[PDB]
Every structure is written in C-alpha cells, then in structure tokens.
Design a protein around this ligand. Structure first.
Ligand code: MGD
Ligand code: MGD
Ligand code: SF4
Ligand code: 6MO
Lengths: 982, 113
C-alpha cells in the first residue's frame, strides 16, 4: 500500500503567508511534539481550509514557503565586513551590539540638531536613517517606531514610499481614508470587475479567486486594461491595451462618457459628493496649468482651489447644480477635452475597445449594479500616480459604487504587512494612527493641535478628526507614561520636528553629497528595489556604516562585493563597515500583520530560528540598550528625548508580541466615566474603543485605530469564527479589522438618503428607528435618515470629493501629463506642458534621463506570479518554477531586430543595462499613438545576484530616479529603453 | 459526622474537592455592604471564611482551588510572561496561588528588588 501519511503525529501551528497582502491562512507542520528535548523543525506547510479569504488555497509563493523557511541562504550568525574588505567575519551578538552603538553614538553626538536657525527646539538627527520591514509584524513595527523617533530620526521609511504612497495621497483627500475600502471575499458580489493598473491574477492570486467567483457565479464581466495581455487577461471577458503612463486620459475619457450619456447615480452624486459646492471664481485651468502656478518654484499657490464661503463660514452650495461655479459644472468642463479620439491618440487604445469598456462601466450607474476596481502599481508608480487614482475614485463616486458590497476601491496592498507599517506611521513625517510629527514651524502644543485638527466645512458633519487631540495625548502617554504631563505639554518637545519630508530619493541625494553617515535596512533590499541601481550602489558606497537585519542574504548586504556585470564594484575602494544581523522569519515568532482589507490577524510560532538568529525586537533592544547605557554613563547630545522613551516590557531585552499589541490597543490609566456617571473602564484595563480615548492624560494608546483589537474580552486578532449570516461574505468573527471591525468602509452610502438600500439584495446597514444596524458595523454615527450628515465621516464636509480642493500638489482635478522619459517627446493634449509641472527632479538625475532618439521603446517593470521581488529566488521550489531572467517583447519588435524567441538580448536605458532571454509574443503589440508606432519592452523584477535561481541582473539598473509629485514614489512603470541582440 | 454525597457508597472526587475549597452558607457581605458571595456558592478565598457558622471549608489553605470560576486544579495555561518560569495559569498552588513563599523579602525595605 501507499506510504503512510507523513504529518500524522506532527505539531500543527496556525500562521499567515509572509509574502503579499491577501493574508492567506497557513497550517505549518513541525517534527517534534513540543517537548523540551525535541527542537521543532518545520517540514511541510499547506493552507488552512477554514480561513475565509483563502479557504485552503495557496499560490506558488505561499505553497513554497517551506523552501524559504529552510533556504540554504538563511542567515545564521552576526557578520561584519570591514572597510575595504572582500569577506565577512563572524562576530558575537555582544560585539555587534557594542560596535553599532559606538558608531551610532559618535554620529549622533556629532550631528544631532537640538535647535533650528529660528530658535525652535527640533531634536532631530538626519545623518543616520532607516528602512523598515513591511514583511515583519506590527509589534516589530511599533518597536521600530519607538527606536527611531526616540533617537530623533526623520529619514525613516518603509516600502509604502515606493508603493502605495500615491493611493494614500489620493484616496484620503477623496474619501477621507487611504486604505482599501472593501475586502477580498466581498469582490464576489460585484457585477463588473475592473483590473486596470494592476495584474491581480499574478499579484494577488488567492484573493483573485473572489473575482473569478463574481465572473463565474454572479455573472460578472471581468475587464483587463494593461499594456500587456497578462495571465489576468487570459480569463477576462474584455481585454483592452493601453500605453504605460496614459491612464489619466483613458479614465478622464470614461468620466466624459458617463457625464455626456447621463450614466450616473444622480441622487448619490447630488447628496454624497461635493458636486453642489461652489468653487472660488479665481479657480481656473488653461493649456495644462491650473491657476496659481509659480514657474520658478515649480509649485502652485492653491488659494484659488477652494470653495466659496457663506456667512457662517461653511462652503456655499447650489443643490440644483446649475450654478456655473459648482463642482459638477467645472468637472464637466474639465473632462470635455477627453473624447474617444483623444483617448485613442494618446493611450493607443482602439476606439472600439474603449467603447466596450465605457458601456460596461456605464451599466453599473444603476443603483443595483456595481463595479469594483482592483488596482496597485500600474497606477501608483508614476509621476502622476496619485492623479491616476483620483480619476478612478471620481468614476466610482459618479456611478454610486462607494460603500456598496461588490463595489468600492480595492487598492490591493503589496507586502504582507505594508498596511500595518503604514498604519503605525513608519514614514518620514508620520506617527501611528495617521497622526503627524510636528513641523518645525509649530512651536508649541497649541499650534500643533490647531494645524492637525480640521474645522468642519459644512454644518452637521461627523468630522471625526476633530478628536485629534485625544489621539495625540494618548500616544504621548503610551510613549512617555508618567513623564508626559499637562505641565510639560505631554512631552511635546521630545519628538523630532521636521523642516521637510525626508523621502528615499531625497535622502539618497543627500547620501550622494556625503551628508549621510549610517543607514539601517530592516527587511528592505534597496540595491534591488530602489530606482537606478548603479546610482544606488554608488550612494551606499559613501556610507561609513550600514546595518542590515534580515532572515536571508540580500543584494544590499553584499553591495560591496564584486559579482561581475551584475555588481561590478571594487571592494578595496568601498570603506563602509557593514553589519549583517540574522533575524527570525514569519514562522519563528508570534504577532500580528494587517492584510489589504485592514484585517489584523494573529499568527503563532512554529520553530526557533536557525543558528544564532534572533527576533527583530531582540535585535533592536540589544542595540538600543547598549546605546542608552553609553548615554547614561558618558552623556551626549539629545539625551533627554532618548532616555524618556518608555520600554516597559517584563524582559527589556525580549519585548513580547502580546505586550506591544496591548500597548497599541491602549489602556485606561484612571477609572473612566461616561457623561451619565456610568463607569466605562477601570484603571489598568484595556480599552474597548477609540471612542473612550481622552485628551487629558487618563488614556494611553500607541495606535488609536487599533483600539478594540485586544480588549478585556481578549485578543480579537485571534478570532476564528468564519460565519457569514448574510451570504455577502462578511465574516465579522474572523480576526479583527480597523476601524472598530467595520469591514466595508463608507457603508452608510450603501443606502439612499432615506436609509433604503440602493440594492435590497445587498443591505449592509439599515435604520431601526434609533440606531444603524445590519450586516456590517456601520461606518457612521447615529444621524437619522434625512439629516444633512454625510457618509464620509473623516471628511470635514462629509462627502466624496470630485474636486480635491487644495489637497493634491498638481491640481484639484486630474490632468494628463507624460512620463519624464516619453516615447513621443511631447504631450498631444498641451505641448507647452509635457510632464507634471510640479514634479521634483534633482539636477544630477536630470542628466541621467534619456530621450527617444536613443531609447525609443517604452520600458515597464512588473511581477510574475511565481516569484516575490528578489526574495523567492532563495527558495528552490520557486526557482524551479521560473529559473531564469527574461524580458517580454512583441513579434514586430523582435522581427525588426532579428531576435528569435528565446535568444539572448541586451536591454539598456540612459542609466545602465541588463542582459536576458527574450520572450517574444503576441501578448505585447505595438500601439498607434500620436502618429507613431510605440513598442513596449517588459522587464520582470525577480532576478539578481544572490539566490538559487540562475544569476541575473537587478531590473532597477534601468529605471529612472524620479517620482510622483505628492509622495515621491518612483516612476518604475513608464520609462524609455533600447534593445539589441546579445 | 457528615457524608453528604449524592451516592453515599461512591463519593465523587469533585464533591470532596468542593468541600475542601469551601462554601458560603448564607449571603456574605463586606464591611461596605457589598455582596461578596451568595448562599450556596463556592468561596474564592480563605479571606472570606468566618467564625460565625456562615462559612464551611474542610481545608482552609485550599480555598480558591475550585471556585465559581471552576476547577482551578485543571488549569493548563503554561504562559511565563516574566521569563522567570513562574506559570500562574498551570494548576493552582496554595496558598492563594502564591508560587514563591515569602516573596515580600525579594525586595528591600523601600520596595526595591
Ligand atoms: N507574484 C507576485 N505578487 C506580488 C508581488 C510580487 O513580487 N510577486 N509583490 C507584491 C507588491 S509589494 C505589490 S505593490 C503588488 C502590485 O501588484 P501589481 O501592481 O498588480 O503588479 P505589477 O506586476 O507590478 O503591475 C501591474 C501591471 O501594470 C501593467 N502596467 C505597466 N505600466 C502600466 C501603466 O502605466 N498603466 C496600466 N494601466 N498598467 C500598466 C504591467 O504590465 C502589469 O501587468 O504585488 C504584490 N504581489
Ligand atoms: N522596478 C521596480 N521596482 C520596484 C517595484 C516595481 O514594480 N518596479 N515595486 C516596488 C515595491 S511596490 C516594493 S514593496 C519593493 C520591495 O522591495 P523590497 O521590500 O526591498 O524587496 P524584498 O525582496 O521584498 O525584501 C524584503 C525583505 O524582508 C526580509 N524579511 C522577511 N521577513 C522579515 C522579518 O521577519 N524581519 C526582517 N527584519 N526581515 C524580514 C526578506 O528576507 C527580504 O530580504 O520593490 C519596489 N521596487
Ligand atoms: S503570496 Fe499572497 S496570494 Fe499567495 S499564498 Fe501568500 S498571501 Fe496568499
Ligand atoms: Mo509593494
């Protein structure tokens, strides 16, 4: 008979995939029953059938986890690379901690800035910066936030900077919050699934099962719009091509089509958006430029981008929508230039295909039909990234799809925990809970609070950010405890104050000028992931010291080592001291991570880490306690802010995940009473809602949107009830979502002004005569139907913005601008303004930009389903599935260059080159754009110089060092290259 | 002598364990007039035992072992939050789940460890 079942007596542990943001459940199997004498070893991993999103399924990345956990390239011991050396030397943990602390202290004491030139206390340290791990837990993230900020760091970013920064920059201004609005299983309710700006069948495969459920079992139409015919196109009902960098034209064309045919949800638009508000008379737009442009600073004065004010100080309105200055009529005028011929001329999308998409989208303007948009980097990674997103969001507000089951904006996050690190604020000027560090002009608490607490711009609105001071003071009580009191303004002056944002491109520009001494890379591989790799390696080489913390060997850790054409450097010329510290991976600790749907999910430890690897919090605590002890005995600069940060863990060298998770939830520091004199919480108890946070020092929380995650009822992130009573796929008992377990944001819009569902088969919330109740937790207060209170409760006007007032850097309405490296060399809509007029482009990077005479083809970079960044090439299973680097090109271009399928080619740009196998296919086809034939060369990003797959070249050797005008997110998706036979 | 078991020829372990823990024989109130236990309920601490005939316990140091919260001797939480190997959630120790006797001496006269 068959071999026996190999897991019958193994230890079974629950955990969550460590790669993308779907958050699939895992069941991991270890050799050993947990007895103290058996050292557990994970030997198989499969899916958890009870998880509501994955239901047992795992894509090739999650299914291959065993080979990542047990990779031959797992890091085992602390290693050190001496200046000008060509080899690693093994050191002890205590030597690593003491050498790093000494280097840090010397640099901090030399360059710490206590006061700025205007006399304000700013306590900031700029010569050492940090990259944080979006693949590590939320408890690691909060420890990293405390470590960084208590030292005064401002150059602190996580992957959000090169990823979904633009989403937050456009979705927050439009709807009030920057996160994905619905959740994976909810996509099954859609009537139309649009995959544009994303490739969900390859980038989020197990979450995409729900789009296949809507197509196959809800009769939905799946549409893919992309320069390439991808694996998501394989299963699509409609495929339409589009030139990289032209989404705003296509989407603005869709707005013009909807308005012109009156394919809108008119009552939704009239009440839930700002359509009826009146805009200042001085607002204008002409020939590519909005009013207020200052051509020398390349920035706009946004004074005119605002509403007209009434007598009470509120925005003026015209409910009939006939006034020439209402948002609705200015929107109509703005998009009138984007006709179907203009879309075809700029995007290259055939009019017949563009028409099919417009007609299907238009069918969801009915109240009981919805479109859901699934997108990610195809829209964010541009110099107009944020504006791409604004256009789509506007479409969803015209169709009335926000707040509906099967509707919304599913901005699919990337890393497993990029949503938690964004929530915890590991971004230059951020604090946890979407709070902001003080700017250096805000000289006291009162100024700071006033700048961050918005006044309502229409009467009768929830305007929930009016509670900013309760969140802020609670954060300060979490950080400083008894040291933060009313008398010292809750420790206000201990936080670093910023003079500007220290985004990654800027900070590498400072590193190139010799202003950066040290850098930490915690679970981030910038040699692979940052634009213009040859410049990145040059900038890192000027560092005096680098600390890498990771479970695997990365290209970044070996940037000083010669790897031939892949990394042609001279070790003897690089003086950086490099510390490589071996950390745990997802399977070797307990903790939480937040998926794309905002679900905070707990996971448990299945084995110890290999060798002398330690957990991320233990590595930060080693360095931190050595450093703070040096300050205790030698003194130095910025002593107080550093020494006042709390580190209240039972074992200070080993902070536990539950202690940190509980601090994020928050506690009552005194007994708390409601207005009726009823006890709401006792001193010492975990809080059950952010509604109980106060601004008087009686409450603490290091992450206000996380209040409710771990209460007196227990760890809600460990809840495993997959019940779905409505049949809509909403499982309120599985894990815990922020905010307050609301799974579908903006769900008051799922009903009309009288409280009646737009679609009676999809009721989310309903009015019972005194409260809202239903199949989801209401994202709303208790305003009764018929009152003026808008459903977007974080917006000061309570509405979805069609016109984004003064929030966007380049305009309150989106406008087409070409990529910095464009194949046309001009912009057919307005040749006087080719590219975004507010883009920041450093002079050194401007010299490294190419033109179409030398680099005639559009270059774009993207992912393949089988690999995750340059991480899974260290896993044998994934290396077998896609072993060797390739690039994709059309049959037409291959014939022109005499390239046969499978031949080697050389792909180059103004910054460098890569060599690879050529995949020649009809899936890529030239498009007719502005009288030219434009070809695209496709460059997957998974290969490099470390790993078990065949050695290749970093794709970022080709990409430009320029980014979105709002978040500085690099333009990785549209640039210019040349190709030659090799 | 009492032999108050549901089957007198086969006294059950839980009946005897509950007698060792002890019971409130009348409703019991603290000095502030707050109910501490109802008549018939298992006591939660020997602090609630009285000398007036309103409480019973056949083993006062065992009060807390099996309360209204259940059999504490069956608790199986091996958590050790301090790292010192103290597992207050595994089984139940006398007296009142104190695992290290004389632990006020683990600090000096001012309370410092
Ligand atoms: N398989 C796999 N999964 C991933 C990842 C991975 O490494 N491997 N990474 C995770 C991360 S961190 C992220 S943020 C996500 C992103 O996930 P996605 O953004 O979906 O994935 P990409 O492949 O980067 O890009 C999507 C598509 O953009 C198309 N495209 C190129 N330029 C343009 C253009 O300007 N407009 C339009 N409309 N489309 C364009 C590309 O051809 C590609 O099909 O993936 C996550 N999931
Ligand atoms: N050309 C081009 N460039 C891109 C993009 C693109 O489409 N085009 N996409 C961009 C985006 S959206 C992103 S997110 C990036 C990502 O690029 P990166 O995030 O730098 O790349 P990864 O290879 O995903 O690196 C993650 C590291 O985390 C380590 N990690 C795993 N778990 C832990 C842990 O528990 N703790 C620690 N300390 N380490 C851990 C892994 O070993 C791995 O080394 O690439 C970006 N760059
Ligand atoms: S990579 Fe994403 S889709 Fe694949 S198993 Fe992991 S979490 Fe699921
Ligand atoms: Mo990403």
């Amino acid at each position: 008979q068959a071999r026996n079942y190999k897991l019958l007596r193994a230890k079974e542990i629950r955990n969550t995939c460590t790669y993308c943001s779907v958050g699939c459940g895992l069941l991991m199997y270890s050799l050993g029953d947990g007895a103290k004498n058996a050292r557990e070893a994970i030997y198989h991993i499969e899916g958890d059938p009870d998880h509501p999103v994955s239901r047992g399924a795992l894509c090739p990345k999650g299914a291959g986890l065993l080979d990542y956990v047990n990779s031959e390239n797992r890091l085992r011991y602390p290693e050190y690379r001496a200046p000008g050396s060509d080899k690693w030397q093994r050191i002890s943990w205590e030597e690593a901690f003491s050498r790093i602390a000494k280097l840090m202290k010397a640099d901090r004491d030399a360059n710490f800035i206590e006061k700025n030139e205007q006399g304000v206390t700013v306590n900031r340290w700029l010569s050492t910066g940090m990259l944080c791990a979006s693949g590590a837990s939320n408890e690691t993230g909060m420890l990293t936030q405390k470590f960084a900020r208590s030292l005064g760091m401002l150059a602190v970013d996580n992957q959000a900077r090169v990823x979904h920064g633009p989403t937050v920059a456009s979705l927050a201004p439009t709807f009030g919050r920057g996160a994905m609005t619905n959740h994976w299983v909810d996509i099954k309710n859609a009537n139309v699934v649009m995959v544009m700006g994303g490739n969900a069948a390859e980038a989020h495969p197990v979450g995409f099962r729900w789009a296949m459920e809507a197509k196959n079992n809800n009769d939905a139409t799946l549409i893919v719009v992309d320069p390439r015919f991808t694996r998501t196109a394989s299963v699509a009902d409609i495929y339409a091509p589009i030139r990289s960098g032209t989404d705003i034209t296509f989407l603005s064309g869709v707005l013009r089509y909807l308005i012109e045919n009156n394919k809108i949800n008119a009552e939704y638009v009239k009440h839930y958006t700002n359509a009826s508000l009146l805009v200042r008379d001085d607002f204008a737009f002409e020939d590519g430029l909005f009013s207020g442009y200052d051509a020398e600073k390349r920035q706009y004065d946004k004074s005119s981008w605002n509403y007209q004010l009434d007598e009470n100080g509120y925005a003026k309105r015209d409910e009939t929508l006939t006034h020439p200055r209402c948002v609705w009529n200015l929107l109509k005028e703005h998009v009138s230039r984007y006709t179907p011929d203009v879309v075809e001329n700029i995007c290259g999308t055939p009019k017949a295909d563009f028409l099919k998409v417009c007609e299907v989208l238009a069918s969801t303007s009915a109240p009981d039909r919805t479109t859901t948009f699934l997108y990610a980097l195809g829209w964010t990674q541009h110099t107009v990234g944020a504006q791409n997103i604004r256009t789509m969001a506007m479409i969803q507000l015209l169709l009335g799809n926000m707040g509906m089951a099967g509707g919304g904006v599913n901005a699919l996050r990337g890393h497993s925990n990029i949503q938690g690190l964004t929530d915890l604020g590991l971004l230059s000027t951020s604090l946890p809970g979407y709070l902001t560090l003080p700017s250096e002009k805000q000289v006291d608490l009162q100024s700071y609070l006033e700048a961050n607490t918005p006044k309502a711009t229409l009467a009768d609105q929830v305007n929930y950010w009016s509670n900013y001071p309760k969140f802020f003071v609670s954060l300060m009580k979490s950080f400083y405890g008894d040291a933060a009191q009313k008398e010292n303004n809750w420790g206000y002056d201990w936080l670093p104050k910023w003079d500007q944002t220290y985004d990654v491109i800027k900070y590498f520009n400072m590193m190139d000028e010799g202003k950066v001494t040290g850098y930490f890379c915690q679970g981030f591989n910038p040699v692979a992931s940052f634009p213009d790799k040859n410049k990145v390696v040059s900038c890192l080489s000027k560092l005096k010291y680098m600390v890498v913390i990771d479970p695997l060997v990365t290209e970044t850790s070996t940037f000083w080592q010669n790897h031939g054409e892949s990394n042609d450097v001279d070790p003897a010329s690089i003086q950086t001291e490099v510390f490589r510290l071996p950390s745990t991976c997802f399977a070797e600790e307990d903790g939480s991570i937040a998926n794309s749907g905002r679900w905070l999910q707990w996971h448990w430890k299945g084995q110890d880490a290999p060798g002398e690897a330690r957990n991320d919090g233990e590595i930060l605590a080693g360095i931190y306690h050595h450093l703070r002890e040096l300050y205790q005995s030698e003194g130095g600069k910025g002593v107080e802010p550093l020494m006042k940060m709390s580190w209240n863990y039972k074992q200070p060298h080993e902070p536990q995940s539950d202690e940190v998770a509980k601090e994020n939830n928050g506690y009552a520091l005194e007994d708390l009473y409601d207005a009726n004199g009823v006890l709401i919480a006792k001193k010492g108890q975990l809080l059950s809602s952010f509604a109980h946070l106060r601004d008087d020092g009686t409450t603490a929380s290091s992450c206000w949107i996380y209040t409710g995650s771990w209460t007196e009822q227990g760890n809600q992130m460990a809840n495993r009830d997959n019940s779905d009573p409505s049949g809509l796929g909403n499982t309120l008992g599985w894990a815990w979502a922020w905010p307050l377990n609301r799974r579908v944001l903006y769900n008051r819009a799922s009903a009309d002004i009288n409280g009646k569902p737009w679609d009676p088969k999809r009721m989310l919330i309903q009015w019972n005569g005194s409260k809202w109740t239903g199949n989801d937790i209401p994202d709303f207060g208790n305003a009764a139907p018929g009152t003026p209170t808008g459903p977007f409760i974080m917006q000061p006007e309570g509405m979805g913005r069609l016109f984004a007032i003064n929030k966007m850097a380049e305009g309150p309405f989106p406008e087409h601008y070409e990529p910095i490296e464009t194949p046309l060399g001009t912009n057919p809509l307005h040749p006087n303004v080719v590219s975004n007029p507010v883009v920041r482009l450093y002079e050194q990077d401007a010299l490294r930009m190419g033109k179409k005479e030398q680099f005639p083809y559009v270059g774009t970079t993207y992912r393949l389903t089988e690999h995750f960044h340059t991480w899974t090439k260290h896993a044998l299973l994934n290396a077998i599935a896609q072993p060797e680097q390739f690039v994709e090109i059309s049959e037409t271009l291959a014939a022109a260059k005499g390239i046969n399928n499978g031949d080697r080619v050389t792909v180059s740009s103004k910054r460098g080159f890569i060599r690879a196998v050529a995949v020649v296919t009809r899936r890529l086809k030239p498009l007719n754009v502005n009288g030219q034939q434009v070809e695209t060369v496709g460059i997957p990003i998974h290969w490099g110089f470390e790993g078990v797959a065949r050695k290749g070249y970093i794709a970022n050797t080709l990409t430009p060092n320029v980014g979105d005008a709002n978040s500085q997110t690099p333009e990785y998706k549209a640039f210019l290259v040349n190709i030659e036979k090799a």
